[PDB]
Design a protein around this ligand. Structure first.
Ligand SMILES: [Zn+2]
Ligand SMILES: [Zn+2]
Length: 60
């Protein structure tokens, strides 16, 4: 695909992942955008926040 996902103003070059979090302002982020490889544990949180934001919600 050729668009623009992560807040890095770019799109899916190859290794990608969606904000596997209920909140997460978006559902598509690049590894160059964030920080990881092959999306650790299979599921990765769109951003260091996309993870924390999920912790702030759902069961406290
Ligand atoms: Zn997110
Ligand atoms: Zn980004």
């Amino acid at each position: 695909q050729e668009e623009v996902y992560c807040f890095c103003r770019n799109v899916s070059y190859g290794p990608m992942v969606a904000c596997d979090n209920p909140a997460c302002p978006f559902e598509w982020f690049h590894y160059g955008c964030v920080g990881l490889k092959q999306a650790p544990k299979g599921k990765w949180y769109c951003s260091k926040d996309c993870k924390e934001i999920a912790n702030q919600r759902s069961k406290s």
